[PDB]
Design a protein around this ligand. Structure first.
Ligand SMILES: *C(=O)CCCCCCCCCCCCC
Ligand SMILES: *C(=O)CCCCCCCCCCCCC
Ligand SMILES: *C(=O)CCCCCCCCCCCCC
Ligand SMILES: *C(=O)CCCCCCCCCCC[C@H](*)C
Ligand SMILES: *C(=O)CCCCCCCCCCC[C@H](*)C
Ligand SMILES: *C(=O)CCCCCCCCCCC[C@H](*)C
Ligand SMILES: [Cl-]
Ligand SMILES: [Cl-]
Ligand SMILES: [Zn+2]
Ligand SMILES: [Zn+2]
Lengths: 21, 29, 29, 21, 21, 29, 29, 29, 21, 29, 21, 21
């Protein structure tokens, strides 16, 4: 999930946008 | 565990900025 | 309103601490 | 919504719990 | 300046990019 | 104005996430 | 890398407070 | 007043950086 | 108090030191 | 040391929310 | 103290409340 | 630079002031 992906690598704005509603 | 909690704090702040009016659901592991 | 946007940033950080492992939903609209 | 209830008046820690999953 | 443009009205993520290096 | 100072603190944190490796400049005056 | 990004987030906030009206340029590695 | 609550959150983070190892006290009332 | 002095006007870094231990 | 300083920054923010009107004293190690 | 306890384990709201005045 | 110095040791206010304009 979001902790697994973005707390092991730097997530860009597009990657962060994936978890939006 | 602490450092994962710290990363999550900055994570939700990033989601608030990126998602904007759409909002988001935050669910930890 | 910028003041509304600033307040929401403190709401999400408050929800992250309050809810913990449960997580939270942020839905302004 | 959380904006109309917690940004116009201060929401206690218990009131914020209403928006937990 | 960024204060006169983004603190009086909400600046989108693209508008904030104008102040990147 | 304190409200201006509070807004600037959210502007710099927004710029840090938005710009990434590019970096940013914050110049109020 | 994540933990350096997290330290940078608190770094720019510290610079915003210390520099004040002078402003600053943030450039990551 | 919500604006007072938001300001206090920036006051405590400012005190943490300013005081350092000395620490600080936050007493609104 | 710190609220009546630093939230109504901007407190410099030296003024914040008055509330250190 | 840096990572303990980073955890302390989120610690005082949590204390500000939880303690509220009572306030708190922050004393580092 | 607070750094020793809450920077090695996640402290809940009740545990954080212990350090309040 | 600033990440190398201040993310390996705690930088004081004077050290942080060095990176100001
Ligand atoms: C989406 O826009 C949310 C709808 C309700 C918004 C209410 C905002 C009220 C304006 C802010 C008033 C307080 C300013 C300090
Ligand atoms: C340096 O002082 C920047 C010059 C422009 C500042 C504009 C600030 C406007 C006052 C704040 C209005 C909104 C308050 C909620
Ligand atoms: C406890 O309630 C502190 C007593 C003094 C509070 C002063 C708050 C003034 C109201 C805010 C004015 C500025 C709003 C933007
Ligand atoms: C919650 O129980 C966390 C579950 C995921 C495990 C995180 C730790 C994985 C190994 C990391 C070791 C590095 C820190 C010593
Ligand atoms: C970006 O590519 C970072 C460049 C600097 C290297 C940071 C890591 C140096 C070794 C740290 C190891 C500790 C974490 C396992
Ligand atoms: C201030 O001097 C800190 C005193 C407490 C010691 C913290 C470090 C304890 C060992 C942690 C090792 C993990 C990081 C390499
Ligand atoms: Cl604010
Ligand atoms: Cl951190
Ligand atoms: Zn704020
Ligand atoms: Zn952090």
């Amino acid at each position: 999930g979001i902790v697994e992906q973005c707390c092991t690598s730097i997530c860009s704005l597009y990657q962060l946008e994936n978890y939006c509603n | 565990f602490v450092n994962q909690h710290l990363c999550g704090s900055h994570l939700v702040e990033a989601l608030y900025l990126v998602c904007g009016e759409r909002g988001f659901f935050y669910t930890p592991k």
